[PDB]
Amino acid sequence: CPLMVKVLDAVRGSPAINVAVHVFRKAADDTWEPFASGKTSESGELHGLTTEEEFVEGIYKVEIDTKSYWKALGISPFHEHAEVVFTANDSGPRRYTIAALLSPYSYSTTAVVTN
Amino acid sequence: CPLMVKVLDAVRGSPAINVAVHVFRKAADDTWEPFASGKTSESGELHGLTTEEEFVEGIYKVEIDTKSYWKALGISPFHEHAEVVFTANDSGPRRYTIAALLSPYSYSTTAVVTNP
Amino acid sequence: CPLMVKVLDAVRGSPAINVAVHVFRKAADDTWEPFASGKTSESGELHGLTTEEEFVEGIYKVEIDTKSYWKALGISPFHEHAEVVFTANDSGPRRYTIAALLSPYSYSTTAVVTNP
Amino acid sequence: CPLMVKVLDAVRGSPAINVAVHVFRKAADDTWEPFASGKTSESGELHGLTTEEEFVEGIYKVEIDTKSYWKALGISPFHEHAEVVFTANDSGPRRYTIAALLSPYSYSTTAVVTN
Numbered sequence: 001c002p003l004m005v006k007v008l009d010a011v012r013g014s015p016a017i018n019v020a021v022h023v024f025r026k027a028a029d030d031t032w033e034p035f036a037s038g039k040t041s042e043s044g045e046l047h048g049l050t051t052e053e054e055f056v057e058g059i060y061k062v063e064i065d066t067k068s069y070w071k072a073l074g075i076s077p078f079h080e081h082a083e084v085v086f087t088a089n090d091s092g093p094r095r096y097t098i099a100a101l102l103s104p105y106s107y108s109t110t111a112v113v114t115n
Numbered sequence: 116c117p118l119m120v121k122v123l124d125a126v127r128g129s130p131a132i133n134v135a136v137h138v139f140r141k142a143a144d145d146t147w148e149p150f151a152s153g154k155t156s157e158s159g160e161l162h163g164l165t166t167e168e169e170f171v172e173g174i175y176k177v178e179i180d181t182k183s184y185w186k187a188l189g190i191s192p193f194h195e196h197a198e199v200v201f202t203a204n205d206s207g208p209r210r211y212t213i214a215a216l217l218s219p220y221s222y223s224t225t226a227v228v229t230n231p
Numbered sequence: 232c233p234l235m236v237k238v239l240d241a242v243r244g245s246p247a248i249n250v251a252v253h254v255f256r257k258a259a260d261d262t263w264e265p266f267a268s269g270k271t272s273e274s275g276e277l278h279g280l281t282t283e284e285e286f287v288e289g290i291y292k293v294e295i296d297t298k299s300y301w302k303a304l305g306i307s308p309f310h311e312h313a314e315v316v317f318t319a320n321d322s323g324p325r326r327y328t329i330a331a332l333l334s335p336y337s338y339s340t341t342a343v344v345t346n347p
Numbered sequence: 348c349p350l351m352v353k354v355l356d357a358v359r360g361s362p363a364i365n366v367a368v369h370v371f372r373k374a375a376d377d378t379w380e381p382f383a384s385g386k387t388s389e390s391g392e393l394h395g396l397t398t399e400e401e402f403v404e405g406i407y408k409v410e411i412d413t414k415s416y417w418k419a420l421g422i423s424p425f426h427e428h429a430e431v432v433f434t435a436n437d438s439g440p441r442r443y444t445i446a447a448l449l450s451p452y453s454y455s456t457t458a459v460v461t462n
């Protein structure tokens with residue numbers, strides 16, 4: 001599992017559950033091609049997006065659909081989505097975790113890249 | 116000034132200086148049209164991107180060129196750019212400050228929205 | 232103004248208003264002596280805590296009373312207060328801005344340190 | 348394990364390893380009594396601090412020794428330590444995770460409280 005996503009809710013102090021996540025890969029023509037998607041689990045995690053074989057070097061975009069999350073909780077949020085855009089590099093460690101901490105008017109995202 | 120950007124560097128404890136910022140607006144055909152651009156000052160602020168008249172309702176993307184910023188400092192960061200996407204002015208005109216706190220493998224962003 | 236505090240509310244996208252702030256300084260005997268206190272303005276800023284003369288070298292604790300802030304808004308938060316502890320002025324006088332971004336189960340804080 | 352700590356490094360994009368963590372409980376006289384301590388693991392985590400039986404309601408302080416962490420990496424940091432002060436409440440979910448994301452001049456901490 002070379003790419004995982006973890007999403008946390010800073011208002012409730014919980015994992016952010018049932019958040020839609022869409023991953024795209026940047027194509028040669030510089031458009032964003034759908035790559036993988038899913039919804040976060042009860043633990044705020046989304047595993048199984050891709051495989052080592054398919055996750056080649058390139059630029060990827062992870063879009064986290066924060067607006068729908070907040071609206072489902074009855075809260076009015078600022079963003080349309082949270083977006084994380086990065087280059088996958090083979091010279092780095094093998095596993096990418098993209099973590100995001102959500103608030104209605106803010107977020108904070110880090111990458112944890114490990115062997 | 117209805118849209119302003121503030122960027123801080125969490126490594127050095129300073130304003131993030133000379134950070135390029137490109138703003139796009141979603142057009143009727145659903146693509147991202149270039150809207151305004153600039154770079155942060157010595158105070159990490161970017162003023163004067165647009166005007167009240169031009170900043171109409173829509174969906175805007177503020178791309179903060181964090182990779183270019185880190186590379187110019189000779190460091191290899193993780194993200195390409197921090198993107199902030201939001202609907203603006205859909206309850207009338209507001210003033211928006213988009214703030215970002217940058218580290219090489221992480222960034223934070225928040226919005227401060229005021230009603231003049 | 233060598234020590235200033237800025238607090239933002241990540242729930243409402245606004246300055247955090249009327250947030251109490253207590254600053255302590257570690258005394259020679261190792262306890263936390265009260266140093267200055269104030270509350271944030273309508274802009275979420277707190278100026279005038281101290282002076283250049285009084286703000287000598289030392290270890291300072293800035294306690295931001297986030298629980299009191301959230302409770303006054305009728306919400307039940309997780310932390311008691313955000314504490315920011317740092318050595319100041321140990322390479323000569325500097326100006327410090329302590330910024331904090333608050334949510335009920337989370338907060339961020341960064342420092343901006345400038346040399347006049 | 349009612350209390351866990353997770354520490355991440357926002358400069359390196361990694362877990363923060365071998366970070367000292369000290370937990371205190373606020374005593375009746377309002378002093379801070381040592382309660383539990385340890386160093387984060389290779390995954391940036393510290394488990395086994397306490398037990399359900401010992402972790403009673405009260406105010407706790409988790410001090411993360413960030414200054415030593417940064418200095419060991421050759422980096423000059425701003426803070427003496429990161430401090431997380433909170434009330435443990437039995438009406439809430441059973442497990443507290445205190446997460447912290449470190450930079451030299453900044454940090455960000457959340458609580459994930461789950462069943």
Ligand SMILES: O=C(O)[C@H]1O[C@@H](Oc2cc(O)cc(/C=C/c3ccc(O)cc3)c2)[C@H](O)[C@@H](O)[C@@H]1O
Binds near residue numbers: 006097108446455
């Ligand atoms: O199940 C697991 O292995 C772990 O899940 C962990 O949850 C995570 C996992 C992860 O890869 C990253 C985070 C990141 C927290 C974070 C905190 C602040 C911020 O600005 C951004 C992110 C939390 C729990 O914190 C830990 O307590 C548990 O053990």
Ligand SMILES: O=C(O)[C@H]1O[C@@H](Oc2cc(O)cc(/C=C/c3ccc(O)cc3)c2)[C@H](O)[C@@H](O)[C@@H]1O
Binds near residue numbers: 214
């Ligand atoms: O628009 C607003 O109401 C306010 O936003 C403010 O934006 C700032 C300015 C500043 O000096 C620091 C900050 C700190 C932002 C911050 C962002 C992310 C984080 O994790 C921690 C702090 C924000 C402007 O300083 C103020 O002039 C304006 O008024």
